[PDB]
């Protein structure tokens, strides 16, 4: 019983004499598969994760400056120069200011003035390239128990999309999965920033107005287009001051509202076919049972109109099979718990069944239990 | 000589027999006023500053959370409650999640779940209200020297807009100033944020989507509309996680591009009339001089076509007056330095004069100086 508690639950039943069912697996969605004369199974895509992305480009959303120095020359005497102008860590701008006798110039007019400051980026985001080969889906498949927990999952690659999965007491199910990515991973980038990750169209990402570097650890972290966070402006023709822009983290979140949020984890969807030829529902061997049952827990209806009945048994036969059906005038009702069995008379066992609409009577015999039930619709 | 070096310089000359001139003072603009038989003066609005603003509202651009706690109840059992729901420091949201036997509920369905977290605002901006009464303009007025510096300013309120200013050796000038604010200070707010200030329309400011408080130091700092930085979202119908938005400092700068940047300082403009009736140009008393001059510094042209001549003198008479005019054929050229005088034959003195367009000859006499000059236009 893995999906009965979940609200986002889907039932997939195979038509007559089918050995197989197609299912679609989305995150947060639990699917119970059924086939006649077969166990009922529950399947869910828990997580998809890509191993080992590659940093395509790191943009920087918050920077600061230091070591500000300026060079200035009087009019007629050429442009100003600073050794820091070819130091890649510095951001610089040249301009002109008023000059005359009062500031040491033999000529009145515009003199060149260059201002340089050390560019230190305080916090950054990074866009990584993700590759279809290095995807891995985690798909769990369980049996619709009947029994109580007494005191598996498959990895899916694009290079190994078929998994054989062995189910104790029930056989071996074969799960054949095709990744249905709604993306082109060369044309989208996985953007991470201060714990949180999205994935977005790439061309957008490379068009974002922030300083960038194809950051290789083989060279120190210099920045291209520093001017998108650090600028300069001329204060009334004699000074030049550095303009730092402030952290674009909030601007980035406001831009990523209409995006898809999240080694590294993601949420996609996956189409698969389950082949159950070598699957057999255990308890086929047993005998329809002899004694009375008694409600261990009151009848409980799930969020899908189906109801849960948990009971404990009366009688001598330890291994046996529950007689079970319901009537308005009996019709063989639908059962999700397939072939309800008694594995241990000591222990209590659950049975999930779909009742008919309106009034129904579920019966479970000599002194059998007649539980009234009603379904609205 | 206070404006000759400045490029943003304006000349204001009074028409015939005027005792007065109207001037307009903007920041970064230096104005030289002239009147015939009067000294030439230089006037500039250095700074305007408002004393003592009042914090109208403080918005918060970066927040963080702490002490996260959740309450949850099973279906049919009412909404979830937490004592922190009326603690103003907490931000909270209620929702519903999947519940059943597997998580301790006797009924399958949606159960209420409330999540609360302590709202701590990390950095904030503030909008202050500014009042016309508490403006003060700093206006400096100097005399167009002639002489060299050898080794004033007036405060202007709206309640005292006329200043008497005493100029040694020249008399007393009376400066009558009207503040021409292009604003309505009740309908604009002075916004400051992490060292930098603008002033913007108020209604805009109160419409900005950030948590706010009319922050009084009389009560601890609680925040209204915390949801504009801290939200909650339901992870697949069983968890609820807090969404912090990130510092809106960069978003604020990007929104304030089309704004007007800057006890607290500002930049406006100021209209004034200068009355110079009790002003007299000193040196009227003296005698046109006897000897030869000699260029102490080569003739230098300013950014306004006018040229500067600095000289030292020959002769016996310590206090005297420079003979001065220029010709193509002499026309009495315009002089900004009014009544060039010899205060100390030891010391050198500057004369600023407007020459005619094209070729001119400036002469300054027995062995007088004939300086060729040419003006392009």
């Amino acid at each position, epitope marked *: 019983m893995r999906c009965v508690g979940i609200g986002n639950r889907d039932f997939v039943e195979g038509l007559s004499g089918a050995t197989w069912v197609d299912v679609v697996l989305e995150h947060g969605s639990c699917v119970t598969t059924m086939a006649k004369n077969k166990p009922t199974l529950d399947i869910e895509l828990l997580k998809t994760e890509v191993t080992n992305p590659a940093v395509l480009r790191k943009l920087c959303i918050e920077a600061k400056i230091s070591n500000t*120095t*300026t*060079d*200035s*020359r*009087c009019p007629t*005497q050429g442009e*100003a120069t*600073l050794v820091e102008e070819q130091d890649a860590n510095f951001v610089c701008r040249r301009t002109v200011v008023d000059r005359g*006798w*009062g*500031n*040491g*110039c*033999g000529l009145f007019g515009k003199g060149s003035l260059l201002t340089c400051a050390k560019f230190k980026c305080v916090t950054k985001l990074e866009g990584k390239i993700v590759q279809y080969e290095n995807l891995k889906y985690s798909v769990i498949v369980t049996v619709h128990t009947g029994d109580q927990h007494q005191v598996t999952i498959a990895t899916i690659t694009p290079q190994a999309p078929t998994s054989e999965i062995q189910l104790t007491d029930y056989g071996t199910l074969t799960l054949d999965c095709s990744p249905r990515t709604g993306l082109d991973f060369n044309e989208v980038v996985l953007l991470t920033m201060k714990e949180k990750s999205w994935l977005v169209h790439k061309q957008w990402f490379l068009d974002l107005p922030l300083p960038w570097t194809s950051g290789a650890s083989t060279s120190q972290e210099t920045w291209n287009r520093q001017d998108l966070l650090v600028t300069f402006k001329t204060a009334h023709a*004699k*000074k030049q001051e550095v303009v730092v822009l402030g952290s674009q983290e909030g601007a980035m979140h406001t831009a990523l509202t209409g995006a898809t949020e999240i080694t590294t984890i993601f949420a996609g969807h996956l189409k698969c076919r389950l082949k159950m030829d070598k699957l057999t529902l255990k308890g086929m061997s047993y005998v329809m049972c002899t004694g009375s049952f008694k409600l261990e827990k009151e009848v409980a209806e799930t969020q899908h109109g189906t109801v849960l009945v948990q009971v404990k048994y009366e009688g001598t036969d330890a291994p046996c099979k529950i007689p079970f059906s319901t009537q308005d005038v009996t019709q063989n009702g639908r059962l999700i718990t397939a072939n309800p069995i008694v594995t241990d008379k000591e222990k209590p066992i659950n049975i999930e069944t779909e009742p008919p609409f309106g009034e129904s009577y579920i019966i479970v015999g000599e002194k059998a239990l007649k539980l009234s039930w009603f379904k609205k619709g | 000589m*206070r404006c000759v070096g400045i490029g943003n310089r304006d000349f204001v000359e009074g028409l015939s027999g005027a005792t007065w001139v109207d001037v307009v003072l903007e920041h970064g603009s230096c104005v030289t006023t002239m009147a015939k038989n009067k000294p030439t003066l230089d006037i*500039e609005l*250095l*700074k305007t500053e408002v004393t003592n603003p009042a914090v109208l509202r403080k918005l918060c651009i970066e927040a963080k959370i702490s002490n996260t706690t959740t309450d949850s109840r099973c279906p049919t059992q009412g909404e979830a409650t937490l004592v922190e729901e009326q603690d103003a420091n907490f931000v909270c949201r209620r929702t519903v999640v999947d519940r059943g036997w597997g998580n301790g509920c006797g009924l399958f369905g949606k159960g209420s779940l409330l999540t609360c977290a302590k709202f701590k605002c990390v950095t904030k901006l503030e909008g202050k209200i500014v009042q016309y009464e508490n403006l003060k303009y700093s206006v*400096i007025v100097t005399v167009h020297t002639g002489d*060299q*510096h*050898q*080794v004033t300013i007036a405060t202007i309120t709206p309640q005292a807009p006329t200043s008497e200013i005493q100029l040694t050796d020249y008399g007393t000038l009376t400066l009558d100033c009207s503040p021409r604010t292009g604003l309505d200070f009740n309908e604009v707010v002075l916004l400051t944020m992490k060292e930098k200030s603008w002033l913007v329309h108020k209604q805009w400011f109160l419409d900005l989507p950030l948590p706010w408080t009319s922050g009084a130091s009389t009560s601890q700092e609680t925040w209204n509309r915390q949801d504009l930085l801290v939200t909650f979202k339901t992870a697949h119908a069983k968890k609820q996680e807090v969404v912090v938005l990130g510092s809106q400092e960069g978003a604020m700068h990007t929104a304030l591009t089309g704004a007007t940047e800057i006890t607290t300082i500002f930049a406006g403009h100021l209209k004034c009339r200068l009355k110079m009736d009790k002003l007299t140009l000193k040196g009227m008393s003296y005698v046109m001089c006897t000897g030869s001059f000699k260029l*102490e*510094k080569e003739v230098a042209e300013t950014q306004h076509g006018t040229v500067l001549v600095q000289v030292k003198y020959e002769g016996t008479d310590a206090p005297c007056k420079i003979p001065f005019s220029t010709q193509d054929v002499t026309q009495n050229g315009r002089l900004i330095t009014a009544n060039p005088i010899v205060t100390d034959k*030891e010391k*050198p003195i500057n004369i600023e004069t407007e020459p005619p367009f094209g070729e001119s000859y400036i002469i300054v006499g027995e062995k007088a100086l004939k300086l060729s000059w040419f003006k392009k236009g």
Partner: antibody
Amino acid sequence: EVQLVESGAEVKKPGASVKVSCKASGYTFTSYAMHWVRQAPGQRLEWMGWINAGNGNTKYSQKFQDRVTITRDTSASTAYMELSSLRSEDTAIYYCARDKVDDYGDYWFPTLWYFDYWGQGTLVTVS
Amino acid sequence: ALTQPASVSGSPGQSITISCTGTSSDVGGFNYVSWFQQHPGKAPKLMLYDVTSRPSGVSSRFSGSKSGNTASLTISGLQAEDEADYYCSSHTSRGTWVFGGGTKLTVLA
């Protein structure tokens, strides 16, 4: 009259920190920047740096950059100069000298008559 | 970074020039050059500023001039008290100050 007066003669031995005061009188202390310059006995003058007494902005020379700290206390018309991690060649007469700040409160271009008034010097001596 | 002689001598009544050579960046590029007179155990006194300008108190004998990268302060009508060290100072293009090595001017008897 304009006057600059610095602290007493001080001897400290290597590794320590030295602090020398400069108090100005006869002019508005906040309208000038205070420069510090030193000279060893019998050698040249070596410009150390300056501080704007209005807003506390500093400027240091390369040789002293993260060894010097020039500060101001406007309350008592005083500028201080502190040297860290003194070594063999730090013995010097230390001078303060003023230069006026422009009409906007900034110090970008000095005035042609910079260092028009000086202190009288204090020796810091090594051992 | 500013160079000048180490010592310069003359006799009473004569004129004597001391030169001060620098860069396009400090001396040849700006009029921010000035001359100071230091006596033994005394503050340097500003005697020239703006290459030719004299503070009130300094007499006409001192005068400055600039040519290329070299400023020159010279004293006329030499006197015995003029015996002193002389230093040249210049603002630089980078907003800093540099001095010369100083020259000890000696006048004999």
